[PDB]
A paper describes a structure:
[name] ([name]) is a member of subclass Ia. [name] is unique among the essential AARSs because it not only charges methionine to [name] for elongation of translation, but also charges initiator [name] to initialize translation. [name] is considered to be one of the most promising drug targets in combatting bacterial pathogens, including MTB. The catalytic domain of MtMetRS spanning residues 1–115 (the N-terminal segment) and residues 226–292 (the C-terminal segment) has a typical α/β Rossmann fold.
As expected, we captured a catalytic component complex with Met-AMP fully occupying the active site, providing atomic insight into the recognition of Met-AMP by MtMetRS. While methionine and the ribose and adenosine base parts of Met-AMP are deeply buried, the α-phosphate connecting the adenosine and methionine moieties is more exposed to solvent. The aromatic side chain of Phe292 stabilizes the adenosine base via π–π stacking. In sharp contrast, we found that F-state MtMetRS is characterized by a completely collapsed methionine pocket, a nonexistent AP and a severely reduced groove for adenosine. The structure of the MtMetRS–Met-AMP complex demonstrates that the ligand and the CP domain can stabilize the catalytic core and effectively restore the active conformation of the catalytic domain. In the P-state structure, the α2 helix (which is disordered in the apo structure) has a much higher B factor (64.8 Å2) than the average B factor of the entire chain (41.1 Å2), which is unusual for a secondary-structural element.
Residue numbers in the entry: 2 to 296, 299 to 508
Write the structure that this text describes.
Amino acid sequence: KPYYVTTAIAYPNAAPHVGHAYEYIATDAIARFKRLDRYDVRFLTGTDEHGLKVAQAAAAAGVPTAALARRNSDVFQRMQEALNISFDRFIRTTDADHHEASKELWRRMSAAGDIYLDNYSGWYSVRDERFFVESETQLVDGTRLTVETGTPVTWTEEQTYFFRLSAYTDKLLAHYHANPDFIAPETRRNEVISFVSGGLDDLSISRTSFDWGVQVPEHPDHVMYVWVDALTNYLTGAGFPDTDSELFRRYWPADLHMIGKDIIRFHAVYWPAFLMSAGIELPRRIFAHGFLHNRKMSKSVGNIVDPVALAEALGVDQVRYFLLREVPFGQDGSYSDEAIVTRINTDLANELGNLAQRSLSMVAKNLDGRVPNPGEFADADAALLATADGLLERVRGHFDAQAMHLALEAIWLMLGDANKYFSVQQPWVLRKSESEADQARFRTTLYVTCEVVRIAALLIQPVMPESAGKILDLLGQAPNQRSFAAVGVRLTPGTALPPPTGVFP
Ligand SMILES: CSCC[C@H](N)C(=O)OP(=O)(O)OC[C@H]1O[C@@H](n2cnc3c(N)ncnc32)[C@H](O)[C@@H]1O
Ligand SMILES: [Mg+2]
Ligand SMILES: [Mg+2]
Ligand SMILES: [Mg+2]
Ligand SMILES: [Mg+2]
Ligand SMILES: [Mg+2]
């Protein structure tokens, strides 16, 4: 019953873009899908408020860092609420309890003998917020940039605590091979295994040139590497260091870390090493998703897609749908103003909206707003119902692999079958007929159409909560008839349906 799922927590240095929304909406779907399938869900999201990337942004505006971090964190939380993210905690690394969780992890790591003091010299990217070797850098017209990210970098000489990541090279490979579903998609798993197979170096995990961060226990001259306290948020969200609490007993180890492909090393290499050191159970699964481009990365150079405005321009549930359908989850895809509209027009307004409005209006005008009593199901009726009866298990299967796009595609294939069934059955002809065989068929074909629309509506709840709820409202479904257990219970004939209205204006 317990299920603990998390998102990456965002740098509140600038405003959110669609990519941030992509990850919160995707993770929200999974969360809502589990709640509807009788799971006890915990859903963590939040912001990563420390580090030099955020401090140098507050210096680029005139405001203290804490204030920039607080204010821009509100903007991230306000954005998530606007997109209807059902998170159970919005964590912020400035929270006092997170300060204590981070300090305990350090203790257990130092007590295991995996932390040692030494001099560090190397090339640090503030944007990426990670260290680079001279080799993974290139000099371009007198500017020092990263070979992969092309990011600026600053030379740094400091005495810092290191982590014996070198001590965990082989345990990690062994864990990777005994836990095949630990990293997904498979392409990314192969990439982590290759990196670790080449050997790991020890990792600087503290800083002395600035104090914006969590205070290293018994060493105020140091603050933790921002990624060390950032990864800890997944423990903080479960009640650590109170490992005897109800929260930590049932929710840790986390079932699923949702992240983007650029931060996999921190989650699949560093994070499990830190937990083996501190004697803590590892997460069960990390799924790294792709990046959303615009026609072109999303650079503050003038190419940002604002998710709140995107939602105001087209609706919350329309954006959530397009993001989880347009892009095979796990691959890289791109946004375009034209692709979102055509997608919405063909998939929501027509393929699903018409089928629901056309069927719900015949019930209003010809059957006195009551679900009709169906007769015997012909071979066309039962085979359509069969398709819709077997969806829950196909869709569940897809959600378990993080393929929401294939879950949606499956729902729409049935809807296509439903429209094509609506056309071969021509129920608008039978309504007029005074014969009794035509009427019963009219009553039967209309029930079948409403019934499969009700199943779709239920299965759509995780992606389009509001619209699905609207459709179920128009189908006379009560508030306790909206779990996945209701999928297998047939629409009750004769229920009073309210007068139909547009779901996708
Ligand atoms: C303990 S976790 C700390 C994480 C760290 N604080 C951090 O990396 O912060 P972040 O704000 O820059 O990125 C936050 C998340 O959004 C993703 N992301 C970023 N741009 C994206 C895009 N264009 N498309 C899809 N996903 C994207 C990105 O891959 C990441 O998973
Ligand atoms: Mg963008
Ligand atoms: Mg397609
Ligand atoms: Mg997707
Ligand atoms: Mg299938
Ligand atoms: Mg009749």
